[model samples]
Target: ELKFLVVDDNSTMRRITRNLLKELGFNNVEEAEDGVDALNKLQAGGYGFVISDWNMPNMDGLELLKTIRADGAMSALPVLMVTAEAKKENIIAAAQAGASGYVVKPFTAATLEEKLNKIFEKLGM
Candidate 1:
């Protein structure tokens, strides 16, 4: 089974994401309060997927995505942005930062599942 990391500042949002991943049959999910913490956990290894929110303190999701992409060891890791940032610029920025998928907040489970499947399919995972 693939391990996943969910990064967000809100505790409730983190819980909701965890529950959603569980419902999708992904039980090995970890939570991080911000991008810094997520980066720390990511450095420890074993995470195959990342679901991150955009507006976090210490470091934002875009920076994290860029960092992940810049790192040779993690450059190809799949990162899915689940954020409230719905702007076209935000989407474009994330795509440029090497995000594997992007889903705006207030999203449905079906949307999340679809994006997840699409990313996985594209990566042949």
Candidate 2:
């Protein structure tokens, strides 16, 4: 089974993400408050996917994405950006930082599903 980690500062956003993943038949999902916490969990291993919010305290999604890409063990781990940062630069930066997919905030469940499916298909996961 592919385990997922949802990273966001807002508890409500984290819950919403978890609920959405569960509705998509993905039950092995975990939550982290920020990039730092998410990195810690990732280092502990087992997680295959990350769905992260960009603007967070103590390290943001971009930094986390870069770190994951730089790490040898988790270099290929997929990261999906789910954030309110709708700026074109932000999307480009996320993509440059090795994000597997990007979804702007206030998105519908269908959008999320589509993005997830695209990532999975691309990765052959």
Candidate 3:
């Protein structure tokens, strides 16, 4: 199973993401309440991918992305942004911050799998 970290302030959304990953053949998933929680988990190591929400307290998604990209140790880790921030600027900012992929909140299993596969292909995972 692929090691995946699902970060969201909402417990319901995190559960959904976890189930989604399980359906995609990954059970090595963990939940983080916010960007800070996600970063703390990441620092402990063993995570290969991240699926995160956009808006949250104690450091948001964009800030988390920048921090992960900036840190040399976690620079190569793939992060997919699964958020409601559907604006052009948000997408552009995410891209510039080095997000591996982007998915809107109302996305389906098809879209999640598609985005996951895209990152898998790129990283040869």
Candidate 4:
């Protein structure tokens, strides 16, 4: 089964994401409160994808993207950034930072499905 790591500082946001992923047929999922903690867990292995929020304490999604790309072992890891920042520059920055895909906030299950499938298709994951 495919696995996912959902990173967000808000428990409510995490719950929402988890539920959405489940609705999309992904049952193997884990959660992290921030980028730092997320990275730590990722380094332990078995994470196929990362779905992260843009803003958070102790480390944000962009930094996490950069960090993942910098690490040789994790550079190719599919990172799908989920954020409320809908600015074009933010999306461009995320793309430039090696994010596998981007999902804007207030997205529906259909939206999440489309984005995740796009990433998976691109990376053959």
The whole-model lDDT of each prediction reads 0.89, 0.90, 0.89, 0.90
lDDT of 2: 0.90
How would you encode candidate 3's per-residue C-alpha lDDT over 35-124 as one tens digit per residue? Answer: 999999999988989888999899899999999999999999899997785677889989999999899987777889999999999999
Cα misplacement distance, residue 28 of candidate 3 (Å): 0.7
- Ordering by lDDT: 4, 2, 3, 1
Candidate 4 residue 96 Cα shift, in angstroms, is 1.0
- Quote each prediction's TM-score: 0.96, 0.96, 0.96, 0.96
User: lDDT by residue for model 1 over 8-117, one digit each (tens)?
Assistant: 99999888888888888999999898888998999998999999998899998999899988999888789999768567788888878888988988776778899999
Residue range 46-125, candidate 2, lDDT tens digits = 99999999889999889989998999999989999976766778888987898998998877678889999999999997
What does the lDDT read for residue 92 in candidate 1? 86
lDDT of 2 at 1: 73
lDDT, residue 70, model 1:
91
Give the candidate number with the greatest lDDT: 4
Q: Deviation in angstroms for 46 in model 2?
A: 0.2
Q: Which digits, one per residue and each the tens of the lDDT, describe model 4 over residues 33-99?
A: 9989999999998888899999989999999999999999888789999878677788899989988
